[PDB]
Amino acid sequence: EWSYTNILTGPETWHEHYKNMCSGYYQSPIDLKTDISTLDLKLKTVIIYRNTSSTETTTIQNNGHSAEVKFPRNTWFISFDGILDYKYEIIQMHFHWGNTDDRGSEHTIDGFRFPLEGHIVSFRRQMYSSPSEAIGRPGGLAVLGIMHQIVESIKYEQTAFKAYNNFSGVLNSQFVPPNNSTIDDINLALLLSLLNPSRYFRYLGSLTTPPCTENVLWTVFIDPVLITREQINLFRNLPYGSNEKQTRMGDNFRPIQLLNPIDTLASRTLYRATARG
Numbered sequence: 412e413w414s415y416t417n418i419l420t421g422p423e424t425w426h427e428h429y430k431n432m433c434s435g436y437y438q439s440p441i442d443l444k445t446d447i448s449t450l451d452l453k454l455k456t457v458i459i460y461r462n463t464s465s466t467e468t469t470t471i472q473n474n475g476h477s478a479e480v481k482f483p484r485n486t487w488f489i490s491f492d493g494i495l496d497y498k499y500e501i502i503q504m505h506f507h508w509g510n511t512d513d514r515g516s517e518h519t520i521d522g523f524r525f526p527l528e529g530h531i532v533s534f535r536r537q538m539y540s541s542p543s544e545a546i547g548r549p550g551g552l553a554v555l556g557i558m559h560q561i562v563e564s565i566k567y568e569q570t571a572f573k574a575y576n577n578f579s580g581v582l583n584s585q586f587v588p589p590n591n592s593t594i595d596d597i598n599l600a601l602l603l604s605l606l607n608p609s610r611y612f613r614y615l616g617s618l619t620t621p622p623c624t625e626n627v628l629w630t631v632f633i634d635p636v637l638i639t640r641e642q643i644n645l646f647r648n649l650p651y652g653s654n655e656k657q658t659r660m661g662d663n664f665r666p667i668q669l670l671n672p673i674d675t676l677a678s679r680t681l682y683r684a685t686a687r688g
């Protein structure tokens with residue numbers, strides 16, 4: 412198995428235990444370096460949109476690694492080109508956080524760690540008919556990264572937790588793995604409106620847990636959405652799976668990978684996007 416906190420099965424081991432593909436040279440997360448990135452004005456505003464006809468329930472599970480929101484099929488989509496033609500279909504959203512407020516994110520922005528990084532996972536429905544077809548195949552996946560930052564003074568309604576509908580209260584010490592509960596749907600469009608959806612890093616990388624598949628189109632928004640200390644401590648109430656050394660769920664993030672390890676056979680480039688000025 413694998414873990415975050417057991418040194419025998421933890422992230423420094425994955426390159427050996429899961430060489431396909433945790434030994435690769437296109438791994439994630441990376442440090443997102445504003446100065447050492449290429450501005451590409453062709454990269455458009457991201458849109459998240461829902462199929463109005465979908466009625467199926469959303470669930471959340473403590474999978475032992477994270478809190479994972481499981482979206483029904485054919486419901487939530489991403490557009491990178493302004494057309495609402497279902498090229499990318501959202502599967503799930505999960506989170507990475509810290510034992511303490513000064514770490515938790517997988518990506519860094521110029522070396523800075525956020526307390527909470529959310530990952531919206533989608534498959535390239537344009538090419539592949541289902542998640543199970545896309546998840547192991549080339550170019551199959553696109554993930555959105557959303558940074559969260561803690562503020563002392565804020566109304567609930569302008570926090571990310573309004574979009575999350577507080578996960579219907581499931582974030583607590585009794586939400587043990589592998590428990591799943593029905594929750595209110597997540598308003599992913601409202602979530603995206605809490606930041607600038609034109610301002611993002613873009614690169615080709617990997618899943619950040621084994622098997623670290625190098626088939627992820629990454630988009631990481633530079634502006635964070637806002638949460639309170641009370642909200643970040645809700646995540647810290649979840650218990651880790653029995654694979655972990657630590658009892659409480661926290662520090663569920665992979666260490667930083669290089670954009671171009673010395674052994675790369677073809678360098679990748681970190682791109683940045685900004686709004687049409």
Ligand SMILES: Nc1cc(C(Cl)=C(Cl)Cl)c(S(N)(=O)=O)cc1S(N)(=O)=O
Binds near residue numbers: 619
């Ligand atoms: N796509 C994905 C899946 C999972 C796992 Cl393995 C689940 Cl069991 Cl949902 C997780 S996990 N184990 O919830 O952190 C992370 C990702 S990520 N960071 O987007 O690479």
Ligand SMILES: *[C@@H]1O[C@H](CO)[C@@H](O)[C@H](O)[C@H]1NC(C)=O
Binds near residue numbers: 462465466484485486
């Ligand atoms: C929208 O949801 C309906 C009802 O569940 C479904 O039959 C339809 O295929 C969905 N549309 C897309 C584009 O997935």
Ligand SMILES: *[C@@H]1O[C@H](CO)[C@@H](O)[C@H](O)[C@H]1NC(C)=O
Binds near residue numbers: 577
């Ligand atoms: C979510 O969290 C706080 C309760 O401590 C509250 O102010 C808010 O009304 C809750 N929202 C919903 C939808 O229950």
Ligand SMILES: [Zn+2]
Binds near residue numbers: 505506507530619
């Ligand atoms: Zn993730």
